[PDB]
Structures are given as structure tokens and as C-alpha cells.
Amino acid sequence: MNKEILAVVEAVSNEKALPREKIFEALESALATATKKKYEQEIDVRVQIDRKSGDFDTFRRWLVVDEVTQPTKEITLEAARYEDESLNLGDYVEDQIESVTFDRITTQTAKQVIVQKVREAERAMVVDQFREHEGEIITGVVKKVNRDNISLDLGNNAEAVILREDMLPRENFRPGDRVRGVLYSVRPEARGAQLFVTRSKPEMLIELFRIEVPEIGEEVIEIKAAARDPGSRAKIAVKTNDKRIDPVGACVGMRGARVQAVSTELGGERIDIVLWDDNPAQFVINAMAPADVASIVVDEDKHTMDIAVEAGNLAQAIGRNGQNVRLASQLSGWELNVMTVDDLQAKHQAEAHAAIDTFTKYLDIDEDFATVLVEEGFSTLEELAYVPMKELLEIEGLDEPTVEALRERAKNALATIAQAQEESLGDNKPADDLLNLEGVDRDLAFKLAARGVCTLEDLAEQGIDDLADIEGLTDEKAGALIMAARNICWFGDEA
Amino acid sequence: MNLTELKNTPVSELITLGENMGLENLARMRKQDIIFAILKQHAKSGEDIFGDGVLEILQDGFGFLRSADSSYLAGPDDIYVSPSQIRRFNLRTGDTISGKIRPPKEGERYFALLKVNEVNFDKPENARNKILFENLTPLHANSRLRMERGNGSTEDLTARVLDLASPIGRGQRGLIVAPPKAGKTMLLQNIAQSIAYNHPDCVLMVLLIDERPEEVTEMQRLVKGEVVASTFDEPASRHVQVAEMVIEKAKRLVEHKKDVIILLDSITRLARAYNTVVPASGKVLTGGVDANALHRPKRFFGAARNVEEGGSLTIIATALIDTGSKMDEVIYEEFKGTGNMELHLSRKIAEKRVFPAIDYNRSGTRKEELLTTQEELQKMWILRKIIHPMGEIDAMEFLINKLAMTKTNDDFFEMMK
Amino acid sequence: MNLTELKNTPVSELITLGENMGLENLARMRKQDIIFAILKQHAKSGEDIFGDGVLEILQDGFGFLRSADSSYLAGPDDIYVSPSQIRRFNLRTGDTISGKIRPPKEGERYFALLKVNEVNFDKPENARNKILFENLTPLHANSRLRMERGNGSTEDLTARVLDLASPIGRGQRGLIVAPPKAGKTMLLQNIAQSIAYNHPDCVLMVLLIDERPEEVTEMQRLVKGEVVASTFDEPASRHVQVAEMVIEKAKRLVEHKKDVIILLDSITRLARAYNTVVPASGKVLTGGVDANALHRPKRFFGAARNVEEGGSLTIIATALIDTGSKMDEVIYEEFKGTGNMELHLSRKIAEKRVFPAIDYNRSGTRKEELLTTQEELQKMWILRKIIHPMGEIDAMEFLINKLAMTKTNDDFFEMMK
Amino acid sequence: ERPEEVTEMQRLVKGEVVASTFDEPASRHVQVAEMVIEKAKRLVEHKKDVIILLDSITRLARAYNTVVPASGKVLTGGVDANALHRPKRFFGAARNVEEGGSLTIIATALIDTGSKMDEVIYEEFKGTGNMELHLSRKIAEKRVFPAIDYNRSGTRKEELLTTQEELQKMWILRKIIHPMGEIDAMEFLINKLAMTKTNDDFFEMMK
RNA sequence: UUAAACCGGCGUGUGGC
Ligand SMILES: Nc1ncnc2c1ncn2[C@@H]1O[C@H](COP(=O)(O)OP(=O)(O)O)[C@@H](O)[C@H]1O
Ligand SMILES: Nc1ncnc2c1ncn2[C@@H]1O[C@H](COP(=O)(O)OP(=O)(O)O)[C@@H](O)[C@H]1O
Ligand code: BEF
Ligand code: BEF
Numbered sequence A: 001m002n003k004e005i006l007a008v009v010e011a012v013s014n015e016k017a018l019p020r021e022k023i024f025e026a027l028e029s030a031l032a033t034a035t036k037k038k039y040e041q042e043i044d045v046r047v048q049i050d051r052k053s054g055d056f057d058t059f060r061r062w063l064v065v066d067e068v069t070q071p072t073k074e075i076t077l078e079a080a081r082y083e084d085e086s087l088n089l090g091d092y093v094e095d096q097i098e099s100v101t102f103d104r105i106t107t108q109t110a111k112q113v114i115v116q117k118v119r120e121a122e123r124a125m126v127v128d129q130f131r132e133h134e135g136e137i138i139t140g141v142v143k144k145v146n147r148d149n150i151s152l153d154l155g156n157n158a159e160a161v162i163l164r165e166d167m168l169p170r171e172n173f174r175p176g177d178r179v180r181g182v183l184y185s186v187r188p189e190a191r192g193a194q195l196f197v198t199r200s201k202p203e204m205l206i207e208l209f210r211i212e213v214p215e216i217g218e219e220v221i222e223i224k225a226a227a228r229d230p231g232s233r234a235k236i237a238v239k240t241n242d243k244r245i246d247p248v249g250a251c252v253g254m255r256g257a258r259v260q261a262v263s264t265e266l267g268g269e270r271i272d273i274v275l276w277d278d279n280p281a282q283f284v285i286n287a288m289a290p291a292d293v294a295s296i297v298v299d300e301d302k303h304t305m306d307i308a309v310e311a312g313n314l315a316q317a318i319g320r321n322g323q324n325v326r327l328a329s330q331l332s333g334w335e336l337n338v339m340t341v342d343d344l345q346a347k348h349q350a351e352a353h354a355a356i357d358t359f360t361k362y363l364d365i366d367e368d369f370a371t372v373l374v375e376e377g378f379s380t381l382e383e384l385a386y387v388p389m390k391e392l393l394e395i396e397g398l399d400e401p402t403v404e405a406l407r408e409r410a411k412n413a414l415a416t417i418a419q420a421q422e423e424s425l426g427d428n429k430p431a432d433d434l435l436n437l438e439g440v441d442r443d444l445a446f447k448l449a450a451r452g453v454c455t456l457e458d459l460a461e462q463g464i465d466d467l468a469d470i471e472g473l474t475d476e477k478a479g480a481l482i483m484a485a486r487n488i489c490w491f492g493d494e495a
Numbered sequence B, C: 001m002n003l004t005e006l007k008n009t010p011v012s013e014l015i016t017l018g019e020n021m022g023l024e025n026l027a028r029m030r031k032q033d034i035i036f037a038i039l040k041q042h043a044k045s046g047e048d049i050f051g052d053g054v055l056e057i058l059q060d061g062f063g064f065l066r067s068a069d070s071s072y073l074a075g076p077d078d079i080y081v082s083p084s085q086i087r088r089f090n091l092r093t094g095d096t097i098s099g100k101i102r103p104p105k106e107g108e109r110y111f112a113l114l115k116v117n118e119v120n121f122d123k124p125e126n127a128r129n130k131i132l133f134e135n136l137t138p139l140h141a142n143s144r145l146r147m148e149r150g151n152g153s154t155e156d157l158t159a160r161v162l163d164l165a166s167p168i169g170r171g172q173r174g175l176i177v178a179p180p181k182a183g184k185t186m187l188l189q190n191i192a193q194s195i196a197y198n199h200p201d202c203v204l205m206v207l208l209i210d211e212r213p214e215e216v217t218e219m220q221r222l223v224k225g226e227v228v229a230s231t232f233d234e235p236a237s238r239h240v241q242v243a244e245m246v247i248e249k250a251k252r253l254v255e256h257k258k259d260v261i262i263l264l265d266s267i268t269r270l271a272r273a274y275n276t277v278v279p280a281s282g283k284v285l286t287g288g289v290d291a292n293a294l295h296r297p298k299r300f301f302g303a304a305r306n307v308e309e310g311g312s313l314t315i316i317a318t319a320l321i322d323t324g325s326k327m328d329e330v331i332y333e334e335f336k337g338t339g340n341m342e343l344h345l346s347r348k349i350a351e352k353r354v355f356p357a358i359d360y361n362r363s364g365t366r367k368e369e370l371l372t373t374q375e376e377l378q379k380m381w382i383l384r385k386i387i388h389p390m391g392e393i394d395a396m397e398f399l400i401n402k403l404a405m406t407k408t409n410d411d412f413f414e415m416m417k
Numbered sequence D: 001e002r003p004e005e006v007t008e009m010q011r012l013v014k015g016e017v018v019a020s021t022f023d024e025p026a027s028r029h030v031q032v033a034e035m036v037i038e039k040a041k042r043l044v045e046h047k048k049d050v051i052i053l054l055d056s057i058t059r060l061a062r063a064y065n066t067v068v069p070a071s072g073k074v075l076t077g078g079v080d081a082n083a084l085h086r087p088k089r090f091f092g093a094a095r096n097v098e099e100g101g102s103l104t105i106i107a108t109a110l111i112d113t114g115s116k117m118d119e120v121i122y123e124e125f126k127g128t129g130n131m132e133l134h135l136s137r138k139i140a141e142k143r144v145f146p147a148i149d150y151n152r153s154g155t156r157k158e159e160l161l162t163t164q165e166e167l168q169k170m171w172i173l174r175k176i177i178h179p180m181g182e183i184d185a186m187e188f189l190i191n192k193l194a195m196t197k198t199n200d201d202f203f204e205m206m207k
Numbered sequence E: 001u002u003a004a005a006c007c008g009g010c011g012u013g014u015g016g017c
């Protein structure tokens, strides 16, 4: 009985891969799978065999969920009054006590679960044998390639995987080749694959430089940041502590030798080596090289930067897929804006004195007084709603009617910003062809237009799933609505 | 109702109360079994019972409410405590909990505590937001606990002598080193009585480990306060159980800013039990004690401390010598260096029918200046100066004669003049 | 941020900071467990934490960054150190390392140190290219470390007497041979205070092994510097752990050319722990000590030395006598011949309330001419000549009276005139 | 052993290096073992000397115990009855011949494995081999290399293994090594032999 | 690569129509 189980746990060879605790939790799982066979009711049964003290005592798990199928494992979110459970989740019961003891199929289940557990322990062992180099360049041959991941071998049954996002979009693979990446994530208690190598994640380049550049590794050239686009283009900003060190010609090497070697090892990946500055403005200026910007407008709160290159170099400054900009938007992590070409592309002197249509009636008790003042800016219209009288003296002739007209125009500015906001938040536009549909009130039209369709033709070409999670309709009324839409648009044969 | 409310009274009232409840012959089963059956019937009357007890936590996570009169041991009236209470309040070991309990349905074990109504004689809100015991800041004995009774009995001297030999205060760690047949029993008896009579503010918790049941009955119904004991009727398992349980109760009561006096006799039998219940490390020490056999005894001994925030824990554990073997003496040694308060008793003078025979020479207290006023400290220094150069018998007969010739201790100072 | 930055302050600020972090009830768990949860939340905010600690190397090759306030012991905030750092820099035991740490993902254990930013308060380049400790050239005490305070306190004499009995300097190996109840505690207290006040250049590292927790709390918040201790709350395993860890920290700090004072009390309990944690060789010595039980204690004792290149390690380990048994005395014997600096304290005079009772006769220093100037050495020789022919009580009362009648030591020389 | 160990052994030493790591089950283990032992037998038959440095013999014994038929009974430690016959044959294949050639095997025994069966092997192998050499791990953990057990090492009929006066001097040297402790003998060994260059130079320095 | 479902040959003798 229990003495036999004690003898087994004393006689297990891998007491170190599986000590007493893992052995009796494995027997917990084994008795659970055995109770799955004892009763046709599929119930999870923890049994806490209490290896050291005594023997098993069967329990019953409630598996708290609103459902009722297999009621041996069904409890709603709050059914915890009886037995003084008083627990929403995790409250489990001990209803059936001393179920069928060990028999031959119980021993079969225990045998198979303990051998697969020894296998899992060996998987933890190979995890330990592949670890200690997490974040270092490693050699490895591949075994199989798939659409979502690839398997890799190093020797000594060292198995790892490289996911789809960890690979380059165009890096062709074939079994037997010796590919290299960096070991980034480890899961010592996973179920399938254990070790994870990558080739597209940014910090890889760092250790690449850490194995290429003799400067880095001793921290004379501290690597600040790096943004990447897998196999396509990677930018990097670095900082040096010494003053006689030139990161443009030391990290690059001799006429493009170090960065070229790193790119050729990466498999043809463009690298842009940029110096990091402690100012985000100059940093984004230097980041988009090769490019030149004479128009800088930085906003701290909006996290935006108006960095507009000169007219003519756009096709090179933005580049394909906006890479030189996109990587920049990943280097600092901010948003940018490049729209103008010819009409006052300075974007600072332009918006400083382009207000001839806004201030038509601001100091308009008598327009023949003075133009609007740009020294304060008059370019916010909302934070300008209240300015102290410390700077409200320089405008000569600020009578009381003038400040009352100022307050009236500030009320007008509040009205116009509220109008612009309500036109800006209204990116649904439920038109009359969307409201007149039977069973679609104003709110349902709001939601339906917020789903992504704003017309009536494209309504008939979305299914129940495409409408699902709607606010105010069930799936059957959903099907009826989309059927009526298809009848009006497709089955009716009307135009 | 409360179990202790049915426990203060003998089995006779329990029998007639069960006859009132209309059950099977009660006198046949045990009196605590009588209480179990009686509470079962009381719950059958359609009312929620109100129970109380100190918490004992097993490996599974639930708890048991051990009662005071059951010597903090396993009983049929040990209230089951669902883990949900340990999830909400996280009541640790020794927390005196009182609340509503329900009868055990069939196939169950004991009564289950539904909702706590009293946590350590305080609101349950203080239970969750509270500073812990091993988390405190230990200090020395600041407040002095006087021992003399004040009416001049013959064994009142047995308290005065302490106040004349080495003072005792809150948070101290006291040892009583004495051979068998020396006078420890009556000593701790009058010590407890004097602490209770002169200082009824502190919580008297007398402890007894592995003695005669007649001694347990003499101790329980003679002194003020709770008297939990475990005689030789219980093995080392129940010994260590009751020991850790009373020590955790004291820890919780000090956490609640209260003073706890723990008079234990003896510490050597506790150490023997501990050495009995430790895993073997493949080696033995001098005397026959395991290596790690002292860790848990040392923890239990050093649980006593004086706190900055509130409360104190002062233990007086008696050490036993002259046992013939080494291991016990070894314990004594391992215990002289951890306690900051020694008190040594004489058997060579006790055989002469000379009581009380306290070793005035090797008695002492560390930081004893915080245990007594200035000029009284000067006078005690001069008195020990007088006691030193004379022989052992000389000092002891001088002590007993001139203190029985006195009534109180300050009267003794004013008579030595 | 830094763990010690959250550790200098009590549990109350930690509780309110965790409430700022918006977590479960913090007061329920331990305060160091509070710090663990708080650092976990701080890492959840998306920032790299900056941690520091001294390195402990296990058999597997990785390391633990034990913190100073945790008494160099196992804790939930012990930063894991991947073996790759031991492959790059090969940081040995005791190297104070500060750097960037990340939170533990689930199924992991503790925080992992990513990149080191500070190695022993120096650049990491000095860590790889450096001369080792056991590779140094040991020498004698060249520079003298004066002990007198300079304002004339009553226990200031307790320092002056040393400067009058036997000087103390950098790289010395000092022993304090004293029985229990003699005055070692206050002695090492004022010794540390005088070293800190008069010589704030050296690194004061006071050590405490197996004492009262109240003593640990009195020592930690009274003296200048780090106070790591291990009371009886920890078994011989954690005792030897903290001992080897502080000794390796001192080794590394001397390797970095810095002076380390290690005031340890007591060495006898350390030797007992060592004898407890040694494999049995099938034989016992006189007193009950294993054969190889002295090798590692002797290593720990002889780790102290004066270096030609830079830094010093001066240990003052207190020896305990009058314990009744032999083995402790045996330790003392095995320790008189290895240390080159003896200092003996008197209990027979301490019982007379005569403090401080230092044995002026058997105190001495080897190569003491390098510890004091020429004419001061002549005057000390003549003073010991005067002290010799008179009795013990005579010398001691002359010492205490005529030094309390003085304020400083050179003033004492100019008064003896 | 580890495949890295096999690669380090093959291309470091002079001669043929045949090995079978854990990549092969007990079948291929016993195959390569019997095959190299029969090659050595034939080479000694052709009057040639063959040194067989094997590590370890305990894993070979485990494989043998794995590939023996069950006799319905087990011994102390978990080893079959006839599980030792073929290992004993493989071990005793080594011998010195009157006619020509020699076969000298140095098989490493493994102890401190926690269980009994391996130790059992060791026991069944102390009595069959006429040459013992014991190594110390309690001294190896002290970073004290090489930690050979000078006490329990020995050779049967060792007078045929060394000249007369060198034998006298080795007897006196072991006499000197005996009465001192283990650590004493080992540190004396390592220090005074690293302080020397060759062995006869060591004899002439002990003088 | 992953998930779900399913998975009388021969002779002999006897008797009957
Ligand atoms: N204060 C006292 N006055 C008178 N007799 C005493 C006193 N203390 C002890 N005794 C004597 O000691 C005996 C009991 O000693 P006991 O307490 O059993 O010592 P121990 O605890 O060392 O065995 C009694 O018979 C009693 O006469
Ligand atoms: N210089 C002094 N002045 C006043 N009291 C002292 C002095 N030195 C020692 N003492 C007394 O002696 C005791 C010494 O205690 P402690 O330092 O613990 O001794 P030990 O270190 O030998 O255990 C203290 O309680 C203190 O009251
Ligand atoms: F006889 Be005593 F109580 F040890
Ligand atoms: F500090 Be005492 F000497 F125990």
C-alpha cells in the first residue's frame, strides 16, 4: 500500500532530477488521470498523498466557472456559502474520500507520467546546459524549417528554436547550415521547445558590436540605443566617455570595415551609425542622416517633433517604407510630421505669421490700432485663455472694452476648439442611409459606423463575426440584420 | 456556548447538563468527549455556538483552535478553521480567536469556525495591519518587576532574595540552574503568586513540561492565570507542540503590546525532546546530542525579548544539573551564553534543610542598572560587597536568618541601616 | 532603486511606499519581504533597478549579492549573478558589486544583475588586473593607530589603557582573553567609537557572533560603519557563512589598498561552530575537538596581515576562558601562538567593581617598537618597569586612579613628569 | 563521457583513441569494449605491449548488468548474479606473458555515487586487480592537486617493478610519509615535488 | 510543423434437406 509507494520513491534513480516533492506531485497527477478512468465523470482530483507522513486522500476540484456541464467541476463566481468556503476562485472541495486504491491501470498511469516527468527533468537539464550564455553569439545547425519557426541544434542534444519574428523576412534556410543568432529568452519549465535564439531583435547588434568593436566591452564607447527593421535597416546611437575617441571612424573602422563586417555577418542589413546626443532635438536631427533639417519644432507634451527636411531630398530622407524616419521614430520613440514642399516649408516662421484669417476681429473695437502680437505667440488659443497682467502691459491702449472683446473672442475660441474636437472625434459619420435602416437606432448606428464601415454597400459584405462584440445586439438579431442588408444590397438587385 | 465555560467546572455539572440535553449516558465517555457531545447537541438546538481558542497551523493551510483547558493539545472540540480565514486575516500561530462555529456534518471531523468576532481581545482590523514579532526591535529590561509580597511570609523571602540577589524585569531572559531535590517547585510557585498578587497587570503564563500529574493539578489551581502543561503522558511530539504553541501565543500577545511571563520547568527535558525529534546528520556531539538539535531550542529560548513599541516577553526556564551524564550539562552550557539573566540554586545547602538555597555568588543580571533605582543600586552593590568575602555557608545562613528577622526588603535596608 | 536605501529606514516608510506602489497589504509579510515586493513593483514600472551587494559563490558557479543590512545572509532580495560575469571579471567572494538588475520572471528565483557598474567603489578595469590577497606580502604593524579620544571620558580611559598597555596598529592580529562577566562588550564599544572618531580614515567593521539580539541592536545603531552580526538565531552554517563572507570582504578591501578593522566577539563560539561543521576523522582531541576542526579557524584568524603594497587587515577577536570545560581553553591555546598581539582582561578584579580590569602583566605586542615613537617607547618601558614590582591590585588601582586623575595620555606622561 | 571530452582525448595523445559516449546504449558499449579487448588480446598474441587506459569501469559494469539475463534474484545494491562474470573476464584479460607482449589495463573505479551497486562493483574489483591506486576528492575540493591517496596505494610484487636501492629508498620514503597526517603527507608531496624537477633529482635532494 | 474526428485454408467424420 503506502509502504510500497515509499519504497518506490526511495528507489527512484533520479532523486536529484525528481526529489520527493516532484515525485508525490507526479503521483497527484497520476491519481487524477486514474480517477479520470475510475468514474465516467471527468473530474480533476488532487489527492495530496502526503508522501513523508502517510498515504493518499482523494479530493474534488470545483473548477470555478459559470457553466454547469460536468457539475462535479462547476461552481459559479460566488457559490461559497456552504462549507464556509467564502472564496470565489480556487475554493475546491473534498467530497469523495478514499476512492479506488492503486490497481494495475493506476500503476500504468503512474509509470507513464513518471517517465515523461523524467523526460521533463532531462529537458530542464538541457535548459541548464544551454543557459549561462543568454545574450551571447552562439553557433548552431538547424534541423527543420517551418512557416512560423525553425529548429536548431548545437550538439549534445541541445535543441532550440528561432521564431518567425526572430528570423529575417528573406533569410533563406536549409537543414545543415550553420546559422548564428543570440540566445535571448529561456523557459526552464516550458512544455515544447525550451531555448530561444533570435536574429532580428535590436540588442543582438549590441553583442555583435561587443564581439566586433574592441572599444565596447570595456565601456569606452557606451552603446546608448538602437532601433531595428529585421534584415532591412538598423540605426544605432552611441555615446563615448573619452574625448579623443571618434565613434564615426572607430566604430565604423577603416573606410567601412567594422560596420560592413557586422552587416555581412547579419546577412545584408543596412546599418546607420549615429552619435547620441543628450538633447532629443539634436538627437532626431542626427538620427535621420543622411539628411539635413533646418526646421525644428519640438513639443514635449504631445511627444511630437516637426522635423522637416529640405525640399528635394525627401525621396532620400524619408526613404522606402519611411525607414530612415520610422527607425528615427523608434530611436527616440516619438512621432514626426513631414508635409510641406514649397509653401513656406520652414514650419516655424510660417505658422508664426500665418494668421491673417484667424484674427480678423480680435482687437476690433477699432481695427486701426495695431496688429496682433507674435511675441507672446497667439498660437495656442486655449492656454492663452488666462495670462497674468505681468505681461499684459506692453500692448498700449488695453482699455477695458478691449479686454472685454478679448474675453468674447476667447469664448469664440473655446467654441471653435470644441467644434473642431467634436468634428475630430466624429470619425464615424452615420449618414441617413445608416440611420434609416430598420432596427438600427442612433446608438447602434454610432457603434456600427465605429466598427469600420460608414456606407451601406460594404455592410452586406461582413458576417456575424465581423459584427460580433457589438453594443446592443445578439448574434441572431445580428444575422437577421446582415441578411436584411444583403437583401437590400445584393438580393434585391436594385440600384 | 464557550467550551472553557463548560471546562472550568468538573465532569459532574457536564453530566447533568448532558442529561438536560437528553443524550446517551455521558459519564461513560471522557469528560472532554462529554463536552464534544454536549456542544453537538447544543448545535442541534438550532443555534450558532460561540467558540474560542489559539490557532495551530498544519501543512495543509487550515487551522485548529486549541483550547486553554485542554493544555493546547489535540481534542474533539478543536475548532476547524477553513483556509479562507488565513487568506483574509492571515491569523498566525498563537492568535487567540473567538467567533461563531457550526456543528460537524457527518463524515466531517470537528466544528468549523464561520466568522471571527474577536482577535486577541481586539478588533479584527488590528490583526491584518500589525507589526510582527520577529520584526520587532529587541531591548533590555527597562521596567522593574518587584517580587516581594509585602506581608512577610516564610516563603515570601524566596521572592525577596531574588530582589536582593538579582532583580527581574520585563523582557528579561532568566535561567534557573539547579540540581534535582533543591526547591525549584515551591520557588516558582511563590514567584508566580508574588507576580500575580503584587503585579496583576501583567499576564501570568506558568508552564510545566514533563512533571508529575499531581504537580500539574497543584499548579493549575493554586496560581492566577492560565496553566498549560504537558507531563510525561505525552511524547516529545506533543511536548514540542505545546511548547511552540505557548511561545507563539506569547509572541502574538507581545505583538498586541502586552507583557507575558513564561515560567518553564524544565528546559533540559525540552532540549531532550528536541534532540529526540531532529533528523540525524550522521554525527553526534559530546554527550550524545545531534548537531542541529540546538537550533530550535535556541529559537524557543531567544523568543523572549523587550520591545520598543509595546509589550514584553520574559521567560524563566529552569536548567537541570547533577544528572550524571554530559548531554544535559551540555544543554546548560549552550544556554548560559544565550540568556542574559542567570540564577543558580544550591542543593549542597538544600540537603542541610537550609531553604531557600540560592547561589548568591554566581547569580547576576546583565544591565542590572536599568532594573533598580540609583541609591538602591549603590546599597545592593555594598551588600554584595559584604556578602562576598564570607564563606558560602556563612553568606547563606546570614541571608536566611537576617531576612527572616525582617519582613520586607526596604525594611531590610532600613534595618541594616 | 538601492535596497539599502530602503533598508536604512524602518518598516513604516516601507509600508507607506508600498501603499504608494498599490500592492497587497504589506505589513502582513516581513519587512525584507516588503522590500522584495516593493522592488518587484518598482521593476514593474518599466525601469532598471540599481542594486548592490557583496558576492557569495556557490558550487554551481553563479553568485548571490548579499546585502549589508541583511547581515550578509540569505534573503529574497539577494541578487542573482549569472556565471558570465564570473567568466568576464571573475569577481571573488566579498567583492562589493553595484549594477543594473532586472525583476525575476515567473518560475525564476530573484533579481538578476545585468551589467556591473561599480566594483569595490572603483572602475571594473581594476577588478581583472589586480594582485590577490593570499598573494600579498604580509608584514608587521608600521603605522600606529592611536586609541584615546581626547576629551577625557570615563570609558575614554578604556582606550588610553590600551595605548598605555600595548599599542594597536594596522595589520595587527589582536586577541582579547577574558572570562564571562568581565567587561568586553563596553570595551569593544568604546574601542570602535574611538577608532571611528579619532581615525575616521579607516573602515570600521565591527563583528558580532552569537550574542543577544538586544546587543546586536545596541551595536548597530551606536557605532560608525557597517554592523553585520549573526546571533544564536542562526545555526553554525549561517555562522560560518557570515564569518567567511566578512573575511572575504575584508580581503577584497585590502586588495583595493584599504584598511579594515574587524572587531569580533567571540572567537570561541566561532571555533565551536567550526568544530560542529567539520567531517569526523574517527578521532577526537583533548577537550572534544576534531583534528581538522582548527584548520579553517586558523585560516580565518591568519587572514589578518599588514601589506607592503596597500591596505591592512587588523582583527581583534575576543577569546573566552573560565567556561569550565577544556575544549574552549584548547581553542585559546591554539590561538595564543598564531596571533602576534595579546590583550588579557581580568574578571577577578571585575567582580570587585573595578573597571577596566585589563591584565597589564600578560598584555604585550610583538615588534611594538614599530607601534610607537622612540622616547614614548622609553617612557612606556620605564612605566612598565614601575608597574611590574607591585601587586596586581596595586597596579590596577594605581592605573585606574591616576588615569582618571588625568585626561589624556601625553598629559599623563607630562604629569608623571 | 562527454563528446567534448572524446574530441579532447582523440587529438591530444599519441595513438588510437576509440571511445563510446552516452550516445550509444549498453549494446554498443559492450561491443566496443569486447572489441578493443580482443584487439589487445591479438596484439599480445603477436608479442606486443598494449596499454588500455579505461574510464570508467563502473559504467561498463552498469552496462553489463543491463545486458545480462535475469536469474530471478538480485544482489545487494541491485546487481544480477551473473552480471559480474563478463566484467571479470574483461578485467582479467590483462596479464604479463612469458612468450611475448603484455596487456596492462588501468581502469578507473568510481565511488561516492550515493548508492550501493557501484561500490559493490568497486569491491568485486579490488580483489581481482593486483594494482590499486586511490585518488582523493576531500583534498581535491581544497584545490590541492594532485590528490592521490599515498596510504592505500600499492602494488603487489612491486620489487620486480624497481631496482634494489631505489626500492630501499622508496621503502624509507613511505616510512617517512606514514606517521604524518593526510594533509601533512599531501602538502609535503606537492610542495617538495614541485620544488624538484625529476624523480632521481628528488632522491638526490632528499639526500 | 500544430489542432480536431474515425479506424475458414485443407482434410476427416456425422447428420439433415
Ligand atoms: N523555601 C522553602 N522552604 C522550605 N522547604 C523547602 C523550600 N524550598 C524547597 N523546600 C524543600 O524541598 C523539597 C522539594 O524540593 P523540589 O522543589 O522538588 O526541588 P527540585 O525541584 O530541585 O527537585 C520539599 O520537601 C521542601 O521541604
Ligand atoms: N567602566 C564601567 N563603568 C560602569 N560599569 C561598568 C564598567 N565596565 C563594566 N561595567 C559593568 O559590568 C558589566 C559588564 O557587562 P558585559 O560588558 O556584558 O561583560 P562581558 O563583556 O564580560 O559579558 C555591565 O553590566 C556594567 O554594569
Ligand atoms: F528533582 Be528536581 F525537580 F529535578
Ligand atoms: F558576554 Be558574556 F561574557 F557572556
Ligand SMILES: [Mg+2]
Residues within 6 Å of the ligand: B181, B183, B184, B185
Ligand atoms: Mg522540582
Ligand SMILES: [Mg+2]
Residues within 6 Å of the ligand: C181, C183, C184, C185
Ligand atoms: Mg560580553
